[PDB]
Amino acid sequence: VLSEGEWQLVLHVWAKVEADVAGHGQDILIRLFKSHPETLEKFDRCKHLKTEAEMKASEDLKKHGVTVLTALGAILKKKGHHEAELKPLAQSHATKHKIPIKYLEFISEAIIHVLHSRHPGDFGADAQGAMNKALELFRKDIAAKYKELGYQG
Ligand code: HEM
Ligand SMILES: */C(=C/C(=O)O)C(=O)Nc1cc2cccnc2c2ncccc12
Ligand SMILES: O=C(O)/C=C\C(=O)Nc1cc2cccnc2c2ncccc12
C-alpha cells in the first residue's frame, strides 16, 4: 500500500509525462531496448537493435510508447484500485505476448530512468521511492493474475 502523499508524488510527476506522452514513450522504449535488447525478440525481427535515430523516426515505436503510457497512466490514477484495468492487460501479456515479470521490471527501470533524467525537480528520493512502490505494486498484482491464467513468467 502507498500513502496518499506517495500517490500524489506519483501523479504529480505523471502530469509532466502527460504534457508529451509520445516523447516520454519514445525515450522509455529506446532506454528499454538499448539496456535489454532481448526485449526486441517479443516483436517482429528486427530483433537487431537499430540506431537511436531510426528508433526516434519509427511511427510504430512512437505508437507503442503511447499505448504503454496511456494504459499505465490510467492504472496509476486508480491509486492501487486497478483490478479492472489490470485484467485485460494480464490476459494479453500472459496468453498472447508472453511477457515475463523480469521484462516488466526492465520497463519499470526505463520509466524511472527517463523520469529522473527529464524531471529531477519532481523526482527526488521520496518521489522516486513512491514511483518504485507504485510500479512494484503493479508488477505484484499482474503476476498474481498471470498465475491465475496459468502463466508462471
Ligand atoms: C508498463 C508496462 C506495459 C504496459 C502498460 C503495456 C501495455 C500494452 C497495451 C495497452 C497494449 C495493447 C493492448 C494489448 O495487447 O494488451 C500492449 C501490447 C503489447 N505489449 Fe505491452 N505493455 C507493457 C509492457 C510490455 C513489455 C515490457 C513488452 C515486451 C518486452 C510488451 C509487449 C507487448 C506486445 C508485443 C504487444 C503487442 C504489440 C503489437 O501487436 O503491435 N509490453 N501493451
Ligand atoms: C523492423 C524494423 C524496420 O525498420 O523495418 C520491423 O519492422 N519489425 C518490427 C520491429 C518492432 C520493434 C518494436 C515494436 N514493434 C515492432 C514491429 N511492429 C510491427 C511490425 C514490425 C515490427
Ligand atoms: O528492418 C528489417 O527489415 C528487419 C529488422 C532489422 O533489425 N534489420 C537489421 C538487421 C541486422 C542484422 C545484423 C546487424 N545489424 C542489423 C540491423 N542493424 C540496424 C538496423 C536494422 C538491422
Curated annotation (Swiss-Prot):
Localization, UniProt: Cytoplasm, Sarcoplasm
The keyword DNA-binding is annotated on this UniProt entry: no
Name of this protein: Myoglobin
Substrates-to-products reaction catalysed: Fe(III)-heme b-[protein] + nitric oxide + H2O = Fe(II)-heme b-[protein] + nitrite + 2 H(+); H2O2 + AH2 = A + 2 H2O
PTM sites of type Phosphothreonine: 67
Record note on quaternary structure: Monomeric.
Family: Belongs to the globin family.
Source taxon at top rank: Eukaryota
SUPFAM superfamilies referenced in this protein's UniProt entry, alphabetically: Globin-like
Coiled-coil region list: none
Protein residues bound to nitrite: 64
A Pfam family annotated for this UniProt entry: Globin
GO BP: any one term: removal of superoxide radicals
EC number annotated for this UniProt entry: 1.7.-.-, 1.11.1.-
PROSITE patterns on file: GLOBIN (PS01033)
Function: Monomeric heme protein which primary function is to store oxygen and facilitate its diffusion within muscle tissues. Reversibly binds oxygen through a pentacoordinated heme iron and enables its timely and efficient release as needed during periods of heightened demand. Depending on the oxidative conditions of tissues and cells, and in addition to its ability to bind oxygen, it also has a nitrite reductase activity whereby it regulates the production of bioactive nitric oxide.
EC class name: oxidoreductase
